[PDB]
């Protein structure tokens, strides 16, 4: 995350880390939606242009984390995947449409002061909260800057970062890029005239873009850190996978009222 700040301990208990076994490399973020289901962006798992194709037993899921690298022996919980699901109409080639994946946990996780699931929006919450103007909150252990001077410092954070940033109107998003924006995306960030910065950046993907409802005092995951042109460029906004339009699929595959 660019232009963010350190998160406090426990402030995003649904933040999950996508950890690759070998070599041990932080691969993306993710979110806890349940004691067994974790939602991520699909291109964490499946990006053919960079020869990126993970199978359930390549990766691990570390839930409860504060520090990027430390083994938080008493707080975090480290899980294996049973099945990975990628959205059948995920378009990595052309526009990154339906950048979503679920992953089911081989065994369910115990909830604590540091592990707890976010909500998934219903129609009225999507209706009333996804508005241009309203701020969301993005967190993640991804790159702090677009590029930096090699070996003069650390370009990825020591701890989970937070940035709050507002949702831009479709037309403005649409005329910020020449890439084919679909109704399964939103873009978010500040305008150049806005005089505030922030973005997500590489390795922040799959991390949740959340909002808090003032009326029930709860948090809803509205989006998934998906793609963008560079990071923290002026007149450039970050794009997220609009979770609410993809919720019927998430229904189909959680299949809750079943076997």
């Amino acid at each position: 995350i660019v232009e963010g700040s350190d998160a406090e301990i426990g402030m995003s208990p649904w933040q999950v880390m996508l950890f690759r076994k070998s070599p041990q490399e932080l691969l993306c973020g993710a979110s806890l939606i349940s004691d067994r289901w974790v939602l991520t962006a699909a291109h964490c798992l499946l990006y053919p242009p960079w020869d990126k194709n993970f199978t359930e037993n390549d990766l691990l899921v570390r839930i409860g984390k504060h520090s990027r690298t430390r083994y938080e022996r008493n707080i975090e919980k480290i899980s294996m995947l049973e099945k990975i699901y990628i959205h059948p109409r995920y378009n990595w080639r052309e526009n990154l449409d339906r950048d979503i994946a679920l992953m089911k946990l081989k065994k369910p996780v115990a909830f604590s002061d540091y592990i707890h699931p976010v909500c998934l929006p219903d129609r009225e919450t999507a209706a009333s909260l996804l508005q241009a103007g309203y701020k969301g909150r993005v967190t993640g252990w991804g790159n702090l800057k677009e590029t930096w001077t090699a070996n003069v410092g650390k370009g990825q954070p020591s701890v989970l970062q937070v940035v709050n940033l507002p949702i831009v109107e479709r037309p403005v998003c649409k005329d910020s890029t020449r890439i084919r924006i679909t109704d399964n995306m939103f873009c978010a960030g500040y305008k150049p005239d806005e005089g505030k910065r922030g973005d997500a950046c590489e390795g922040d993907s799959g991390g949740p873009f959340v909002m808090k409802s003032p009326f029930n005092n709860r948090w809803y995951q509205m989006g998934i850190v998906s793609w963008g042109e560079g990071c923290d460029r002026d007149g450039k906004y970050g794009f997220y996978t609009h979770v609410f339009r993809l919720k019927k699929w998430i229904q189909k595959v959680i299949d809750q009222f079943g076997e």
Partner: peptide, 12 residues
């Protein structure tokens, strides 16, 4: 990429 321990049980 500055990572710590994790029980080898998970890295196999």
């Amino acid at each position: 990429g500055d990572f710590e321990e994790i029980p080898e049980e998970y890295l196999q």
